[PDB]
Write a protein that binds this ligand. Sequence first.
Ligand SMILES: NC(=O)c1ccc[n+]([C@@H]2O[C@H](COP(=O)([O-])OP(=O)(O)OC[C@H]3O[C@@H](n4cnc5c(N)ncnc54)[C@H](OP(=O)(O)O)[C@@H]3O)[C@@H](O)[C@H]2O)c1
Ligand SMILES: NC(=O)c1ccc[n+]([C@@H]2O[C@H](COP(=O)([O-])OP(=O)(O)OC[C@H]3O[C@@H](n4cnc5c(N)ncnc54)[C@H](OP(=O)(O)O)[C@@H]3O)[C@@H](O)[C@H]2O)c1
Ligand SMILES: COc1cc(NCc2ccc3[nH+]c(N)nc(N)c3c2C)cc(OC)c1OC
Ligand SMILES: COc1cc(NCc2ccc3[nH+]c(N)nc(N)c3c2C)cc(OC)c1OC
Lengths: 509, 510
Amino acid sequence: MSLFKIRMPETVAEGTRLALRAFSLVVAVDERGGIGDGRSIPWNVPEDMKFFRDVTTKLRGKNVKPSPAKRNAVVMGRKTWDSIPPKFRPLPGRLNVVLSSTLTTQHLLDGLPDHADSIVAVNGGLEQALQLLASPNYTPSIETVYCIGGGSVYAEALRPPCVHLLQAIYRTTIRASESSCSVFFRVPESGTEAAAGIEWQRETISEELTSANGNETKYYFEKLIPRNREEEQYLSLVDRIIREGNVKHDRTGVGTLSIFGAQMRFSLRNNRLPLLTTKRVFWRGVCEELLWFLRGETYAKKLSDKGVHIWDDNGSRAFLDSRGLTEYEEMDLGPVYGFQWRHFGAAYTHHDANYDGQGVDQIKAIVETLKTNPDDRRMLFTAWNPSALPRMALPPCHLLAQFYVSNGELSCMLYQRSCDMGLGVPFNIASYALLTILIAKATGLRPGELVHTLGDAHVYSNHVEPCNEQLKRVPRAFPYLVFRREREFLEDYEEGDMEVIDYAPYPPI
Amino acid sequence: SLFKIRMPETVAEGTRLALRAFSLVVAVDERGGIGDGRSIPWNVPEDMKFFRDVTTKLRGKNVKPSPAKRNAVVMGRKTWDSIPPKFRPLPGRLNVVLSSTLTTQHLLDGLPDEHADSIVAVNGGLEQALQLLASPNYTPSIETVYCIGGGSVYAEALRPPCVHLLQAIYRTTIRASESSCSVFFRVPESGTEAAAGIEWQRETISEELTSANGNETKYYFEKLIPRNREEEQYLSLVDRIIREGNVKHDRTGVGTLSIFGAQMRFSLRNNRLPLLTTKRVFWRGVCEELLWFLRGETYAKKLSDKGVHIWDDNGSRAFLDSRGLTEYEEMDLGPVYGFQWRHFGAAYTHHDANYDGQGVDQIKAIVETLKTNPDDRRMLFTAWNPSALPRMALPPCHLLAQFYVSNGELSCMLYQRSCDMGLGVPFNIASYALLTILIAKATGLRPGELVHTLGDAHVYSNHVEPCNEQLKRVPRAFPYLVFRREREFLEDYEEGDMEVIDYAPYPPIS
Ligand SMILES: NC(=O)c1ccc[n+]([C@@H]2O[C@H](COP(=O)([O-])OP(=O)(O)OC[C@H]3O[C@@H](n4cnc5c(N)ncnc54)[C@H](OP(=O)(O)O)[C@@H]3O)[C@@H](O)[C@H]2O)c1
Ligand SMILES: NC(=O)c1ccc[n+]([C@@H]2O[C@H](COP(=O)([O-])OP(=O)(O)OC[C@H]3O[C@@H](n4cnc5c(N)ncnc54)[C@H](OP(=O)(O)O)[C@@H]3O)[C@@H](O)[C@H]2O)c1
Ligand SMILES: COc1cc(NCc2ccc3[nH+]c(N)nc(N)c3c2C)cc(OC)c1OC
Ligand SMILES: COc1cc(NCc2ccc3[nH+]c(N)nc(N)c3c2C)cc(OC)c1OC
């Protein structure tokens, strides 16, 4: 069963090679927005120093010791490096990236010593640095990148192409003011040319604190984030369902609030992955299940074994019996999803039987069509097989997708009949994002947009309370998907082959 | 007979007698006053002329008004009384008078001595008059209906249920201020409460004119229409495609501007039929094809013999041969659309073969579920069959529909993979409007909403210039579907059974 597989083309890698790495930015400014005199930092505020060290050293997981394996990186201009006393450099617990056209890596090591490799020089600007940090050697070993700046470096961060990779701004405002500030830092206001389409929202602001520096200086911290309209689509819909939805009751008898017919878009460009930030999504499961679908797999134990239990309840003897499927071996789910994708209309017996070259192979057909006739409007697959329906543990929710090509980009539309806004929808968004990414790789195209179409969009009545809390969260920027390695056939791709980078969801509640 | 779907015994709880679409004609002062209770306070002959002309004239070239094809004017009794006996009835128009006292045989009399049968008394308000003018008796003869008023009639015209049938308002403003006016008329402004969710817009306004009554009385005309948000929604999509769409090319190699993924909604409530007004839709064709779909038919000759030729190219000996279908006889389209709806997955041989009981009857199941468990989330039928595809003349374009129930109303969603905005789309909107209306009747629910999902929504390159001219047009209101008779079985509906009322679309784009 090898000639029934999808062969990936020679241009599989350049499809999804990460051009630039996503970064955050950390800065201190006065009320006039000035950042320094061009070689030194004017003010002395120890509480800003503590914040700076903390935001740039600490890692996502709790109590995780920074190490070559997993650490943060700080990127700085040469003059900023010079402003730090040689005794305190390199900054401990972080990878020091220094921008200079006159100083090499080894050259920086001269200066003060006297460890491992905590210093790298880059001949170029911030783009070149983010480019280097995009390579396997730094992705995903380096968890978060911070631009600790220098005027010209901040200047480069705040304009294309870099500004579109800027995920957060951690700004300290010092309430002093003087002539001595020559270099400046200003965040572009919403809807201006300098903003290049981005709309900076305020995530948090601290109360005004006083600095114990002898000068009684006031200061405060702000975290700014780039407005995530895509996730707001989703949040809006949830809010509309609670406010205006109809009370319905699904098969069990559980209450639900329901709206009918809706549509959402998500950009897949430049490695961008629409994993929701207001509530963490179980990505590993998303990844494992799609690959399981793609393979035409119908044995749930293959997911259960890899620690993915989303199909556990639907695969039990108890449930299968209650669907009259009394002859299915436990975890055998019948001709569901993947089977219809790769073997449409094929007669089903048991999971472990051979189904090679049986039924219609819709995925393969689409892959072949995209490569030859990209303008084709029949490029779509479905899992809604009325004949097979009774033989399935469960009817498909996401039952149809159509692909579309424009300017060498692959868009895909998914139609979902029943969409649980709490769990299904976030999961399925990621799922079809991955599919579209993979299919694009398989056809030598770039990812485009994912369009989601919803039928009965519902929120569960007891979920209303949790959901209302989540509505008061401002969506954060989406993470990115990169591939550790490629594989010769499509069906050979494993979860470990790909990595989700810069995923910073909110905590549970 | 046997494998067909039996219609319910009754009309769905809440359904309504068909109401006619009307325009309102009025003369007001700047304070909004229309009269003193029993007469008009001012003398402005130029308004009399405008009133005669707007209510008398028909749509054609020089079509003399006759009992065969004419307009109607609905008025209150007091208004009738105010018109001096020697001018009743108003020539070239059906005169509909509202009165609980006076009958047809009462008003006539009334007049000098010698007689017109262009009069009918109605014992009820404007609603009853609009009901009456929707009768099989009146819908041939009566082309446009005018509300020429009386304060009480205008009031009724401006509130639900009547206000929703108001296609236009022809207001004459007389620039006198008169204290004695005790009866008033205000057109409610967009966004306000009295507007009741209607957005009134000025279509035209005359320059200020002076009357020749020898008082230099200033006056002006304006036409006010309700905004058709839903056709605006379609047009904006068309306009967005032209402005932002990508250049693409169909199978033949013809140019298109296209966009991917869009969604439109249309209301079907009380059998409102979203037939687009800015370019005439071929309704008869839409109707015949749908009933053809519902019956599970696959023989296009059944369609082309009813003078409906949409499937002609796709049915020819030459075309079937090119799709590899050397076995099908001319016009045998294979297991397409209707076949999949009523026999999903059945082996196909020929159009004339018996298919009873074979495959899956998706419609019959959907109908059944709606009747018993309407919160169900599996009430959808697909024509997209990957097994059957290569045996079809054409793969389905509109390929999936989901049903939904809420507040005793049946809504429906349509997925369409390829969307031509000029011809295919407005046609399909009407197809699924009708379907949802029929399925509602079949399951005893009243019609709800049609949601339309578009895949590859496109406009043809050559069709760009004509579209831009259409885009400049202001949308008129949507017509209504009236079933003039009923059937025992859903499959038994002929096109003749249903009448579309008040569909007045624009002439062909020049
Ligand atoms: N307020 C704050 O928290 C904050 C933070 C950081 C820094 N600062 C202040 O900002 C001031 C320094 O600002 P600045 O803009 O003058 O200096 P800078 O950004 O720190 O350094 C600029 C240097 O970086 C290198 N560089 C920049 N772009 C390059 C490119 N495209 N290709 C190759 N090399 C490139 C060049 O070094 P080579 O000449 O060696 O090639 C250039 O001279 C200092 O006063 C510092 O204290 C303030
Ligand atoms: N400026 C203009 O464009 C314009 C146009 C027309 C009229 N007007 C003026 O408006 C004034 C009259 O206004 P109005 O409201 O008092 O009179 P109206 O609307 O013309 O007539 C009211 C009468 O119509 C009948 N009617 C109305 N609703 C009915 C219902 N629901 N069921 C049964 N019968 C119904 C009743 O007659 P019965 O008592 O017999 O039952 C009622 O008394 C006059 O001054 C007239 O000149 C102005
Ligand atoms: C704490 O260690 C030190 C760090 C620095 N770096 C400059 C400096 C200071 C505050 C800062 N604060 C923020 N928010 N962001 C920065 N990018 C930042 C930088 C870049 C300079 C020092 O010498 C004055 C020093 O030793 C005290
Ligand atoms: C049609 O001829 C006549 C009509 C009327 N009816 C009142 C009247 C007057 C102006 C009007 N003007 C407009 N814009 N619309 C009307 N609805 C209207 C009506 C309803 C009264 C008449 O006697 C003075 C008369 O004979 C000249």
